[PDB]
Amino acid sequence: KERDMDELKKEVSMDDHKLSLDELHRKYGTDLSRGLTPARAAEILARDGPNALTPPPTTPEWVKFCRQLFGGFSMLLWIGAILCFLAYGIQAATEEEPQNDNLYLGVVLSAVVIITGCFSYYQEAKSSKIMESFKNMVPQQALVIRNGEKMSINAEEVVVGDLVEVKGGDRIPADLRIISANGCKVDNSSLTGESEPQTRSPDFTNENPLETRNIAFFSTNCVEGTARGIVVYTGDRTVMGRIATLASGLEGGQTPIAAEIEHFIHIITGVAVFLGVSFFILSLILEYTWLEAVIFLIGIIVANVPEGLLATVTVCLTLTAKRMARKNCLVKNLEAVETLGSTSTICSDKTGTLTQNRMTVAHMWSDNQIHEADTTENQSGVSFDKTSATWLALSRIAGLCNRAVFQANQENLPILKRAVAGDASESALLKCIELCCGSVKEMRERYTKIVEIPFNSTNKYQLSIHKNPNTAEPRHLLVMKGAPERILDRCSSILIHGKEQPLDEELKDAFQNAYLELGGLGERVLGFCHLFLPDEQFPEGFQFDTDDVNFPLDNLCFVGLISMIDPPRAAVPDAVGKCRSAGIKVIMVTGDHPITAKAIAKGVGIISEGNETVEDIAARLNIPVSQVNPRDAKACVVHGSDLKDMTSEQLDDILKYHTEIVFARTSPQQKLIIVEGCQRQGAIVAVTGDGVNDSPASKKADIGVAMGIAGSDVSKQAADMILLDDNFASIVTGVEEGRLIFDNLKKSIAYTLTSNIPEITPFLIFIIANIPLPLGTVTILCIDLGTDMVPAISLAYEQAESDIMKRQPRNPKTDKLVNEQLISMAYGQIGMIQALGGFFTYFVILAENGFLPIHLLGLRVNWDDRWINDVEDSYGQQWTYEQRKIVEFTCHTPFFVTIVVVQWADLVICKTRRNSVFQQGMKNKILIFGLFEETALAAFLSYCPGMGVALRMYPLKPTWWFCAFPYSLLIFVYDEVRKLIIRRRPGGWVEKETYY
Amino acid sequence: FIWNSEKKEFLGRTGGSWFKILLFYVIFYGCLAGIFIGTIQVMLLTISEFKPTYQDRVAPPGLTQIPQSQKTEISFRPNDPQSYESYVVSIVRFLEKYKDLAQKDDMIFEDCGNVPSELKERGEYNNERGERKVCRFRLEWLGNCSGLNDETYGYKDGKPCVIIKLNRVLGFKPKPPKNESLETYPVMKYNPYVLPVHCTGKRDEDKEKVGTMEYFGLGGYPGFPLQYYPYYGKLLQPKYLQPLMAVQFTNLTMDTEIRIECKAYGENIGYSEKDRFQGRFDVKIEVKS
Amino acid sequence: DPFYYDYETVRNGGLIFAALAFIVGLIIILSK
Ligand code: BEF
Ligand SMILES: [Mg+2]
């Protein structure tokens, strides 16, 4: 009954936070300031499980290695090996020739398969090796209170229902019910995706227990202050514990590639048995007695299946996924490399993912004008005009006034991605200071701090006083930052270009409308003000204290607002500009707030400047929201409120009638059913995240994407891809590569397959007209697997034939890797002309020595009898055995020579699917090398001494090579005029029938 | 899905335009062939209608038997009439072409020496001369085995016997070994006009030697008469009758199986280790009764 | 005699044909 368990996990959770602290004290049994004794806590730590996740339930031993031994094609080839040995059978028994024939092949088959799996397992184990070197779990010990006494035991000996006390810096040990707090803002960015740090308190606020205030959550850390509260849920019972396991407990889902693998095995084996097996029925169907009529089937049908391509494939992907390994983005598995190129929809999270998850100064208010800072992570952006004095002032204000400070080793790190013990506003501020206006080390030590006032309880003000190092006015300096509304109340004088003024109600509403304008753009705004002290009323030596008003609280001198928001990663916006350029829907899912999410998404272009939601259309008309037709809003914003309250066809209608979708306030589990929903359309889905709310959406996506440093641990093991440098521009590469590697493999398969036509056609007619064996298996082994190896790999480095980021993504149903035109091409026309030349290569030689073509009918009978040493030709010459067999294996060897020859034409004409080879050119180096090496291996093999003795293949007389010439020629000619007429008139005929 | 059998205005897969796909394939294959067929027709005007362009592969001719057994093993019973019928029907049809009344037309036959003579060069290998006469062959020169009515018949029913025949090689002026015979074992001082062979219990070590041999030839020599070499080919000499050579095993232990290699010597004759039949000849025997 | 082919020279020669080709490509694939 565990799918019923797998299902109360795709459901929103429920709890009990809304009680009187007394009602609390009655249910669990413990005291509020004194807690539970420690014999009761040595009775609860063993009634269930220590506050601990069941380790990842997945632990497959090194016998998991038979996984890369079966699958779709290897297990589709697996039979073949057994079939060979099954065909090997008779030889072993009846005195024939099993010693070295149908036994080596079996070994070869096994070995080939073995290699194929010993090499796609080795990598997929040097990449499960290099991601297990990043898990630095520093275990963090809970401050638990027990028999009054604050007893901070190990993170693993705590229990449901005893107090725990967070201070600043303590990871939260488990899921609590706050019973007391003091300025306690915790950071749950990791668990729900909330961005700025959130305050924590005991009273009861919301109801969705995630966003409520009297509940913290594991894995998130308490940012500032201190709190006391009560442990509700422990171990696997927490919220991030319901989510890790459901992440762990869903299916990776099939990849569109191993699928284009399967429907290929469908056609490969599909006709394989359909023809071959039915064709040896014909062998015995003529008049061949059953007993030995099928004594050659084991082998003649073997040629039909393309032994070798198995290796050529697992390499065409290996070279691709070694190039993505050079740009900082790792694939846990092979086949996922392609997936991105077939993506029509990209989900993507806001915090930790699209953003840097680090507060940073956004906009600034000075001289009744707004200035946009630089908000990136590698300083490639726009720096404001830092010449006005209004800036210089507002600057030393924020610089002097902070509790925030740099750590020791923070020098060589980028001024932004480096660390700051301290607040968020005080971190982002300190941050934009040390970057825009010089160093803060000698500016915060130039002014002597007299008496400070940290963040207060009533009103909002943080203030400090210093003395005057300037030479002009030795008057004293005072500074204060605070809320726009409650600092506009206590203020009067103003500041511009170095001279004061007062509050006019004109610029007070230009201030009330660029506070509500900068604040309405999602940015938490903060005013900055300063004042001089009347150095006649307070002297140059009077150390003030902290008991009474020592200086004018009113008639201060306001300077400017200063805005901050979590800003996108730099490479984000352009990445998306390409996203839609290729027609990929970009939807945004996030567990964050709909006004901070409305400003970031407009800022990124998921919502192009200029679709109105259902809500922008209704406050602007000043009508009730229920009035507008949702048909007229091209974009839309949906509060995850309505989302729980929603079915399938509904969700069906939103993704359908809305181009620019931004989801907000969605639990981790709600991102699954989103992926699953963009998945009830038939499209493929590509998911990218940071914390632990993505673990479910990262696993159920066709492919999940994570972050390397800014990510957590439960969506870095579930995703099917990881982004190491956190560079989000790297995704632009990935949809380009899987789409390209798509189009190259199509050429790659059609190459080896064409081989398969002059491959078997020999084993065929040899049975038809009773002629000697025009081509051998050993031969058959050095093409499918010997020479054809490197050219089938060189074709993987082919480049692009049009603009790839221009064509929309592929329809998983229509555009087939192997569609029915390729075979009408590789099996239809080329392999035919291909067969044509080897067989032409085949007559000349038996004819030139003495065996005329019309003569050779019915021959093979007398010719395969080991005892007929007198065998007349048309000229009347008597031939022994080893003599005419020698003429046989050298009608084996050059047929193979003739093959590579046409395989030249083929490789050159498969290189481009649409473009003339004179426009695309022979810029492919490896491909030239292929030509050179394949010919060389070949020519090395025939003329090497004792080659006739080992492999049954001898040196060719010279006049044999050039026989495949006008064929490989007419081949190159045929496909080139083929690939020109398609360039001219694609619409009528031609293209439709051929274009593979 | 798996049900695109009879789709609307379409059969399984496509069909509305089948005539298009199909017609393209007939022309194409009809043209793939008229090319290939050109090509092989080319290849056929360059083959000397008279001499094999390449003959190097038959460089060493070989020694074959008349009763081309299953595995050079003659296993029979000198009693049961059928034990030996595979073998003597094969002997009966082999020389079916050598009876003297078959070869009656003097137009194509000529009466040559009845003793081993010199090379009957009849011109050059072109067609400027008419059709060359074929030297005749009388079963007589093979004695006691199918030598006419005197004995034979049981064709080896009692003491087994077999003819050796050389492989016709177009042109072979077989060169025999000179009077300085580089160890050619016991043979008579007629090394000039004849090409020899001889047989052995075993090859080059100790041998279960059990046998007394008796050879039958043209006027009584043990080899091949040169007045019939090398062959002018099938189109120039049809019904040509190549020399045959008969070896007989009298003293044979019956219920045991030994072996016999028959080699043939000459600069013009060579031997292969991988081919037991090049230049030499192998037969095992078992007169099981 | 037309019954003896010089197999050893065309053999010594395809091997030459093979290296040069094989090494031209090793000069083709390392453009430096
Ligand atoms: F972390 Be995201 F904003 F859902
Ligand atoms: Mg996030």
Residue numbers in the entry:
A (entry chain A): 21 to 1016
B (entry chain B): 15 to 303
C (entry chain G): 17 to 48
Wording from the paper:
The Na+,K+-ATPase generates electrochemical gradients of Na+ and K+ across the plasma membrane via a functional cycle that includes various phosphoenzyme intermediates. The enzyme is a binary complex of a large α-subunit of the P-type ATPase family responsible for ion transport and enzymatic reaction and a β-subunit acting as a chaperone and functional modulator. Furthermore, regulatory FXYD proteins may associate with the complex in a tissue-dependent manner. The ion exchange is driven by ATP hydrolysis via enzyme autophosphorylation and dephosphorylation, and a minimal scheme of the Na+,K+-ATPase cycle, also termed the Post-Albers scheme, includes two major conformations, E1 and E2, in their phosphorylated and nonphosphorylated states.
Structural rearrangements in the BeFx complex because of Rb+ binding and occlusion were followed by soaking E2–BeFx crystals. Two datasets were collected at 6.9 and 7.5 Å maximum resolution (consisting of 11,991 and 9616 unique reflections, respectively) at a wavelength of 0.814 Å with a strong anomalous signal for Rb+. Indeed, the datasets for Rb+-soaked E2–BeFx (here referred to as quick soak and long soak corresponding to 10 mM, 20 s and 50 mM, 3 h, respectively) produced strong anomalous difference peaks (5.8–8.4 σ) at the cation-binding sites, reflecting exchange of Mg2+ with Rb+. For the two quick soak conformations, one protomer was fully occupied, whereas the other showed partial occupancy (with an occupancy less than 0.1 for a second site, assuming a full occupancy of a first site). Interestingly, the anomalous difference peak for the partially occupied quick soak protomer overlapped with the Mg2+ site between the two K+ sites I and II, suggesting that initial Rb+/K+ binding takes place at this exposed site prior to formation of the properly coordinated K+ (or Rb+) sites. For simplicity, the protomers will therefore in the following be referred to as the initial (Rb)E2–BeFx binding form (quick soak conformations), the early (Rb2)E2–BeFx binding form (long soak protomer 1), and the late (Rb2)E2–BeFx binding form (long soak protomer 2) when discussing structural changes. K+ binding associates the extracellular part of αM4 to site II, most likely through main chain carbonyls of Val322, Ala323, and Val325 engaging in coordination. In the initial binding (Rb)E2–BeFx form, this results in αM4 tilting ∼7° toward αM6. Although only qualitative, the occupancy analysis revealed that the initial (Rb)E2–BeFx binding form has only partial occupation at site I. Furthermore, the anomalous difference suggests an overlap of the initial site with the Mg2+ site. This indicates that going from the E2–BeFx open state, K+ will bind in a sequential manner by first binding to an initial site that likely overlaps with the low-affinity Mg2+ site coordinated by Asn776, Glu779 (αM5), and Asp804 (αM6).
